[PDB]
Structures are given as C-alpha cells and as structure tokens.
C-alpha cells in the first residue's frame, strides 16, 4: 500500500541514499535488470525520482526499488523487447508509404518489412503508432 505522501518521500529518500552508495541512475536499472527480469532504463529511474510517472507506475516500481536499496545497503556492491532504433533512411521510406497508403494490409506490411529488412510486427506497430500521432497532431 502507498499514498502520494509516501511516494513523494521515498523518491526524495531514494535519490539521497543511492548517491551515498555511489550508484548512478543507470546503474540502478542495470542492477534491477539482474535482480528483476525486466531491465529498466536510466530514463525510468529519473522519472521515478522526479515523480514524473503515473501513480500506479510508481506504486509498482517502489517495492522493487526498495528491496534493492535495502539489500544493497545491507551488503556493499558497486519479457519486454528492446526498443528498435529506426534509422532516418528507414523512417523516411515508411513515411512515404504512409502517405500513399495510410493503413497497410498485413501483406503490404510484410513486403515493406522485406524491403527495409525489418521484422513485420515492428512495421505493424509503427503504422499503428503513426496513425495515432496523426490523430493527435491534427485533431
């Protein structure tokens, strides 16, 4: 159980205690990756300490971070796909495909995947995300 009051104080306390232990934000995530299956990023740790994550996202991460800090203070020390980086050339081709066909078919997605040497699901997700972006930018 947690409350906004407790979360505000843990983020303050966590940053203070981690720096004294000598861990950087990225090191915390990498240690989290060994302790817990999912490897967390420096970006996520910075957002947790800045209270710039959702209430439930923070409530979920707090116990995992608390165990690491207490376990690491005790003893001295020191299922999610990796984000695919789409190079500028691949992105420009995909944007061109989005113009001529806004919603590609699975067969069209498969061809584009072979053309740009990318996995199909990534292309499918890219078009899904791209469509949502168009909706937000142009209400």
């Amino acid at each position: 159980p947690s409350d906004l009051e407790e979360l505000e104080k843990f983020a303050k306390t966590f940053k203070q205690r981690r720096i004294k232990l000598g861990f950087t934000q990225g090191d915390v995530g990498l240690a989290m990756g060994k302790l817990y299956g999912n490897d967390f990023s420096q970006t996520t740790i910075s957002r947790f300490e800045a209270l710039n994550l959702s209430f439930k996202n923070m409530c979920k991460l707090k116990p995992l971070l608390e165990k690491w800090l207490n376990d690491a203070e005790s003893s001295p020390s020191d299922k999610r796909k990796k984000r695919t980086s789409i190079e500028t050339n691949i992105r420009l081709t995909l944007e061109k495909r989005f113009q001529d066909n806004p919603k590609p078919s699975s067969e069209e997605i498969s061809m584009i995947a072979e053309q740009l040497s990318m996995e199909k699901e990534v292309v499918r997700v890219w078009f899904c995300n791209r469509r949502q972006k168009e909706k937000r930018i142009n209400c």
Binding site: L4, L7, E8, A50, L51, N52, L53, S54, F55, N57, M58, K133, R136, I137
Partner: protein, 32 residues
C-alpha cells in the same frame, strides 16, 4: 523562437501534478 507542437505520448497525469493539486486543494481546505 517559435513554439513547437508537442509530438508524442505523455503520462496523462503525473504524480507530480497530482501532488500539486492536493497542495492547492489543501490550501483552500486549510483556510476553510
């Protein structure tokens, strides 16, 4: 300098924002 249009996804409501709203409400409630 010209304002850009924010492109991307944002946390709809951050804990930071929720905390700020409480303090605003608490200020009015404390007075009343």
């Amino acid at each position: 300098e010209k304002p850009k249009v924010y492109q991307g996804v944002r946390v709809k409501i951050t804990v930071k924002e929720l905390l700020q709203q409480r303090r605003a409400h608490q200020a009015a409630s404390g007075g009343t």
